[PDB]
Each structure stands twice: as C-alpha cells, then as structure tokens.
C-alpha cells in the first residue's frame, strides 16, 4: 500500500556486513535430526555476494517503518497472535484454541508487535529487542520498504555459519565454550520452567552475546528468522545447478522457511538451535518468538 522510497547503497548497507561470493557446505548430518526437517544432505553451495544485517530487525526499526507507512501487520488484521503460555499475564483474555501437539502456545487477542504479550503490555523497555509477531508478509514489507529483501535459506546459513566449515553452532561445536553462554535459548525443563541461566526468559536485545566470525549477532536462538524460501524437506536433495548455485528453494509451497531457533528451543525437545536446523511457518502466521533480519544485493 506504500510507495518504495529512494535509498542510497550506503544507507541500505548501514548495519549490514558484506558476505563475499564463495562456496560453503550447507546442511547437517546430526544423527538425531528429525528426518522430516530435511536438514540433510550436506552439500556444497556457491553463492553470489550479498549483504546481511548484523542484527535482527528491532522494535525501534519496525516502529519507524510503521510510522512512515501506516502498515497494518497480519496480527492486527487478524486480531490475535501466539504468546508463550508463561508470558500471558493473568486476567488477559485468551482464545480456547489449541495448537495441536503444542499446548504451551496461546492465541491471545490483541497480541501484536507493539503489545507482545497482549492488551496491556508494551515495548517501551524493549526498543533494541527483535520485533516479533511479524509474519513473513510483514517482514517482506519492511524489507522492501527498506530497500532490502529476506535472505534465502542458503544466504542465511552461510552468514550464520560465520566462516566455519560445518560447525554445530555459529561459534563452534561447544554449546557453552569455556562454560559461557553464547545464545539465548531455553535452560531447564521445557515447557514447564526456564531457568534463565543464559540471562533471558524472553527475547534479548539484538546485540546480545558475542557475534560470529562474520559479525552477526544472535543467529542462534533469541527469535526464529523468516527466510525467502518456500519450505520443503527434499527439494534440496536433488543435485543440480538450481539446488547448488544461488539456490532459491522450491518454486512453490505452503509454508516459508524459518531459521536459527529461539529462546524456547532446548535439546530435550526440538534441538533446533543448531545452525543446520530448520523449520517453517505459514506466511501470515506470527508468534512471540519469531522475527527476521534482512539481506540486500550490493
């Protein structure tokens, strides 16, 4: 509904790192991987050079987009969004809706990006947190307004891997090297109690913890990140140029790829904060643990 504003390369590039063109080994061979996630095979992928944000898009940055355009997010058009059960303050009205197999997810009317736990919450103390309750549609809109685009899954994974060849995490193979926490995921007993041992039992600021070798922050944990690709478990098992040179994912689908894991992920349940991990969500869905960062062409 809004015209695309004129932006300079250096304005688009602010807050982004230049990933140089090259190959990298994409995917995972973890024996415990859920086969339905299609984390394999591991393959070599060549990519044209691209820019990617150091940070997930923040609340402050999303509010600017909303203020400049008047964009209405899918969660506002719908009237509700998904809030984790422990974060719904008592008294808040909730739908009786049950996400099958995930009763910890609550449909809260009036939960959206500026009120992430429902009516009566605010983001005044979370300006540098990742924006959440943004659908894939909302993300594309921001990106296009900003002169950017969502990363492909391969761009996302190349950048999140930080110049490491087939490490488990963005920083290496140890979850907590030297016993220090490196991302915001779950600790304790999911979904009953998060001990917050890494410092956060919700979103953390987008600059939390140390960056990976390419300078990216919180590619592991904090919030799931929308990518451009249609989801599939097996399109990328074919060996062809379409799947190994600047791959765009399948031409069609019903859900869009999400990468990186979030503050709810934990080894005992999903184990999806590994950098090869992947899942999806339908493109107008939104939840309290899902955001995005942008990519751009140089």
């Amino acid at each position: 509904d809004f015209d695309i504003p004129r932006r300079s390369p250096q304005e688009i590039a602010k807050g982004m790192v230049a990933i140089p063109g090259g190959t990298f080994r994409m995917g995972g061979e973890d024996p415990d991987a859920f086969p339905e996630d299609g984390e394999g095979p591991v393959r070599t992928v060549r990519l044209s050079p691209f820019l990617i944000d150091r940070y997930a898009v923040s609340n402050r940055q999303f509010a600017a987009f909303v203020k400049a355009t008047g964009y209405v997010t899918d969660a506002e058009r719908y009237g509700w969004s998904f809030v984790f059960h422990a974060h719904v303050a008592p008294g808040t009205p909730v739908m009786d809706a049950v996400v099958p197999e995930a009763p910890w997810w609550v449909a809260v009317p009036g939960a959206y990006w500026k009120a992430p736990e429902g009516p009566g919450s605010s983001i005044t103390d979370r300006p540098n947190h990742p924006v959440v309750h943004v659908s894939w549609n909302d993300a594309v809109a921001y990106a296009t307004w900003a002169g950017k685009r969502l990363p492909t899954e391969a761009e996302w994974e190349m950048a999140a891997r930080g110049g490491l060849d087939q490490a488990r995490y963005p920083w290496g193979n140890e979850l907590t090297p030297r016993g220090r926490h490196r991302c915001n995921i779950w600790q304790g007993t999911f979904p009953v109690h998060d001990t917050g041992e890494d410092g956060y039992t919700g979103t953390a600021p987008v600059n939390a913890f140390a960056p990976n070798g390419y300078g990216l922050y919180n590619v592991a944990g904090n919030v799931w990140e929308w990518c451009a690709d249609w989801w599939s478990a097996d399109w990328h098992a074919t060996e062809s140029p379409a799947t190994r040179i600047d791959p765009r994912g399948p031409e069609t689908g019903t859900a869009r790829v999400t990468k990186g894991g979030s503050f709810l992920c934990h080894e005992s349940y999903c184990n999806r904060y590994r950098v090869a991990a992947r899942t999806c969500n339908t493109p107008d869905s939104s939840a309290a643990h899902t955001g995005f960062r942008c990519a751009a062409d140089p």
């Binding site: 859920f34 996630d37 998904f82 799931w224 859900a255 894991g261 969500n281 869905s285």
Partner: peptide, 14 residues
C-alpha cells in the same frame, strides 16, 4: 512422539 513443533501456524488451530 512425532516431530517437535516450533513454528505455530494460524492454520494449525482451525
């Protein structure tokens, strides 16, 4: 017992 679910979709509740 099946596959863990991290992406909750609007369609899943219908």
């Amino acid at each position: 017992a099946t596959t863990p679910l991290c992406g909750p979709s609007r369609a899943s509740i219908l």
